[PDB]
């Protein structure tokens, strides 16, 4: 149903998901001069050493690398967060051209892609309950710029041939998501939403200041994926990003000055 085309894209989503016009929608433009440094924000705690990746799935909108979230194996804590959030999956949003693709923007600048490491608050028991709560999710967002290759990403790139079309999945064990992080964990944070339907307003967004660099060949391989299923007309999976939404009554906070 919904997607990213002329006839089903972000400007249409509000007709089935009226919260698309809500008070805390994501993504947003991060105006760096307007964000407020909050010296009481704690450093992020990323504990991924016990992460257990399971599978990679083309869901028709992006690809998801899924993790075992039945125990506290890969968790995000600290920063603006209270409690413990478990990593359930990561995915990306990217463009058809290197000058677009990210969901968040920084002083209106678009990056080539954006990584979302999705975590849910363990006090709610399961991801489906968590998305119903204003503090249910924490998504760690990391920008990708085109330049040198990111070695930690290559294993992802290399399996994409096996999940070209919607509904395909492949075993994807022993992937270490720590290899996708930049050096610095300086971040901006604001309350927001899922950036795809159902657009639920359940996300504490934590967007890293420092982008990672990926090579032109790496992002080109993202762009060879397909939104369609096998045996349907080929539509390249590109430009699967929602544009920046109004900030409304929200202040973006920075962990760094
Ligand atoms: N984007 S949305 O509100 O879920 C949307 C927009 C246009 C649509 O056309 C449809 N017939 O296949 N479904 C649909 C959903
Ligand atoms: N793109 S996003 O805001 O990180 C995100 C994260 C988890 C999600 O689950 C979804 N369907 O149940 N959509 C979705 C978007
Ligand atoms: Zn996302």
UniProtKB/Swiss-Prot annotation:
Changing residue 114 to Q has the effect of:
Strongly reduced activity and sulfonamide affinity
- Name the reported effect of residue 194 to A: Reduced CO(2) hydrase activity
- pH note: Optimum pH is 6-8.
Effect on the protein of changing residue 91 to C/D/E/N/Q: Strongly reduced CO(2) hydrase and p-nitrophenyl acetate esterase activities, impaired stability of zinc binding
Q: What would changing residue 116 to D/N/Q do, according to UniProt? A: Reduced activity
Q: Which InterPro entries match?
A: CA_dom, CA_dom_sf, Carbonic_anhydrase_a-class, Carbonic_anhydrase_a-class_CS
Mutating residue 64 to L: effect? Reduced activity
Q: What is the effect of changing residue 59 to V?
A: Reduced activity
Q: What is the effect of changing residue 59 to A?
A: Reduced activity
Give the principal location in a single coarse category: cytoplasm
| Activity regulation note | Activated by X-ray, histamine, L-adrenaline, L- and D-phenylalanine, L- and D-histidine, L-His-OMe and beta-Ala-His (carnosine).
Question: At which residues is Phosphoserine found?
Answer: 162, 169
Q: Which family does it belong to?
A: Belongs to the alpha-carbonic anhydrase family.
Q: How does it assemble?
A: Interacts with SLC4A4. Interaction with SLC4A7 regulates SLC4A7 transporter activity. Interacts with SLC26A6 isoform 4 (via C-terminus cytoplasmic domain).
Q: What is this protein called?
A: Carbonic anhydrase 2
Organism listed in the record: Homo sapiens (Human)
